[PDB]
Amino acid sequence: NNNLGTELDYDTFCFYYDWYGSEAIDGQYRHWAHAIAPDPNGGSGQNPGTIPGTQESIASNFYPQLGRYSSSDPNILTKHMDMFVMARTGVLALTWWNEQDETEAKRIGLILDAADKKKIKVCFHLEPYPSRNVQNLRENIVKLITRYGNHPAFYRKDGKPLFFIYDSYLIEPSEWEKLLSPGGSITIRNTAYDALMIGLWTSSPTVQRPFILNAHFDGFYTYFAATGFTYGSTPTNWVSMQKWAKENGKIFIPSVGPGYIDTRIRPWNGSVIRTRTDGQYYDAMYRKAIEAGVSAISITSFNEWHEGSQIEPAVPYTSSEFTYLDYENREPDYYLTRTAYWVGKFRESK
Ligand SMILES: OC[C@H]1O[C@H](O[C@H]2[C@@H](O)[C@H](O)[C@@H](CO)O[C@@H]2O)[C@@H](O)[C@@H](O)[C@@H]1O
Ligand SMILES: OC[C@H]1OCC[C@@H](O[C@H]2O[C@H](CO)[C@@H](O)[C@H](O)[C@@H]2O)[C@@H]1O
């Protein structure tokens, strides 16, 4: 029955990426090495090349305290779960790409096991995998609930699993309705595979309100850590988004993050940079979410190192190939402990 102000919050979801590899464990320094994206407005014949994922040159503007780690290393996973405990983030929202490979399956099991040791829960963030559609989504939801639903770390809210659906707008509401209306042709409602389905609110209310209603989503999130990147990721809209959610029986889970920078992998994307300012950016965004009066908050991200949105500890590093950004006047674990601060403020408000 403790009341220490240190406990995990199970309405706080932190987006987690399990796609990092090491040569030793995975055969390649996966994701630390990454293709550089061509400029979509830069014309033909670009040869942007690749970041090689050497110790000196990784696919991030920051540098992990844990180095070029493997997401399959149980010892890294232990450390990450201890970081979630420090942050008070009770739910790990795991990227899920439907890779259909044994190394994926192994990783997911390792993450569930490590999470449970620290009473962390896991939900899935369903990514835009090839030919994703409501039929294979249903099949995959069935598979995930069947495989993992009895694992003690599998997240439930009032008895239901929860999924975040990235880029949900890539599927028409008429298709979503088949899966998510109680009357839908292939409904999950009232079945063993029912779940809270949280779609991505992107653009203006004139588009998103009917999308969400007609698709029969249970709620919506915003993902992007960069303020103003979309209507949904503009925090001054969050009070009105929450009002609409409450009026329509939907769960709004705004996404907050500490900054954004992706110019190692997208050199042309500098206008999306959002400076961390020693934590002031994160504070401002988190405060807006709490002030909007929401029931749940998502954090972009634990470890999306390519996009510079991570709260995972980063260290100063200057190599012969790149001078990395770092947490400046703040210590490496600052964003974990600042997350814990905001989780406490959120709980005080709840
Ligand atoms: O700024 C780049 C942006 O790229 C990716 O987002 C793309 C797509 O998935 C989003 O739905 C739309 C929203 O308007 O933007 C892009 O086309 C993500 O990797 C994102 O975090 C990143 O900022
Ligand atoms: O988890 C939702 C999205 O989060 C942002 C990253 C995005 O993946 C794309 O971008 C990354 C680079 O940041 C690439 O490594 C991926 O292959 C993908 O293009 C997630 O979908």
Side-chain angles (χ1 to χ4, degrees), residues 25-46 48-78 80-100 102-105 107-116 118-159 161-245 247-315:
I25 290 175
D26 308 284
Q28 49 175 161
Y29 279 98
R30 183 73 175 105
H31 272 261
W32 305 117
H34 199 289
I36 299 167
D39 180 354
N41 306 121
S44 73
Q46 299 174 59
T50 72
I51 301 285
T54 56
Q55 188 170 351
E56 298 86 2
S57 188
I58 67 167
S60 181
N61 294 71
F62 293 88
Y63 207 92
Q65 184 181 57
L66 294 177
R68 292 176 296 155
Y69 60 80
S70 171
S71 299
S72 308
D73 183 341
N75 300 311
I76 294 291
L77 297 176
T78 295
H80 285 175
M81 303 310 158
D82 290 340
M83 293 172 178
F84 272 62
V85 171
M86 181 177 286
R88 305 180 65 194
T89 52
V91 195
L92 183 160
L94 178 58
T95 192
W96 191 84
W97 288 91
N98 193 22
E99 296 180 328
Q100 296 168 343
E102 65 187 302
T103 70
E104 175 184 75
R107 209 160 54 227
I108 296 167
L110 291 173
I111 289 166
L112 287 163
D113 287 349
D116 195 52
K118 304 294 155 50
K119 327 300 181 172
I120 297 157
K121 306 301 174 186
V122 176
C123 71
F124 295 93
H125 189 188
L126 306 180
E127 298 279 10
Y129 60 81
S131 294
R132 182 175 67 168
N133 64 59
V134 295
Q135 182 68 59
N136 62 44
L137 277 165
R138 197 183 194 283
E139 290 162 348
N140 288 324
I141 288 164
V142 169
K143 185 180 72 73
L144 292 169
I145 291 171
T146 300
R147 283 185 178 188
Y148 305 120
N150 290 320
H151 194 286
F154 187 91
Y155 180 74
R156 288 188 169 82
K157 177 68 178 187
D158 307 317
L162 181 150
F163 297 92
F164 293 91
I165 312 298
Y166 188 68
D167 284 1
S168 49
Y169 64 83
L170 294 172
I171 292 171
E172 291 296 303
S174 63
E175 287 291 292
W176 286 116
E177 182 278 340
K178 294 153 53 158
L179 186 68
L180 300 184
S181 172
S185 297
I186 57 165
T187 190
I188 65 177
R189 306 310 183 184
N190 307 306
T191 78
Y193 310 106
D194 206 343
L196 296 170
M197 297 287 282
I198 309 300
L200 184 68
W201 177 304
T202 54
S203 66
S204 73
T206 44
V207 177
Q208 301 304 299
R209 296 169 165 184
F211 173 88
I212 291 290
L213 293 176
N214 291 333
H216 294 257
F217 278 102
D218 301 283
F220 55 94
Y221 74 126
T222 60
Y223 190 74
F224 307 105
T227 52
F229 183 65
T230 62
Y231 181 100
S233 66
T234 303
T236 53
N237 298 322
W238 291 349
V239 164
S240 62
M241 289 164 66
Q242 170 62 11
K243 177 169 181 289
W244 183 85
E247 289 169 347
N248 289 277
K250 305 303 184 185
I251 304 161
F252 177 32
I253 314 186
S255 306
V256 300
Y260 189 94
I261 177 163
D262 68 1
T263 54
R264 288 226 78 201
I265 61 151
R266 303 186 184 111
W268 46 267
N269 206 33
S271 297
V272 189
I273 293 169
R274 300 289 181 274
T275 55
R276 297 208 176 200
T277 57
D278 282 337
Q280 294 170 96
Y281 180 94
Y282 192 38
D283 287 351
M285 201 170 188
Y286 224 128
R287 196 175 289 118
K288 283 288 177 194
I290 295 165
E291 290 176 346
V294 300
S295 75
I297 293 173
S298 55
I299 301 172
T300 301
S301 60
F302 184 69
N303 64 342
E304 221 297 15
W305 287 96
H306 314 307
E307 293 186 356
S309 60
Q310 75 295 329
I311 65 168
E312 184 180 0
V315 290

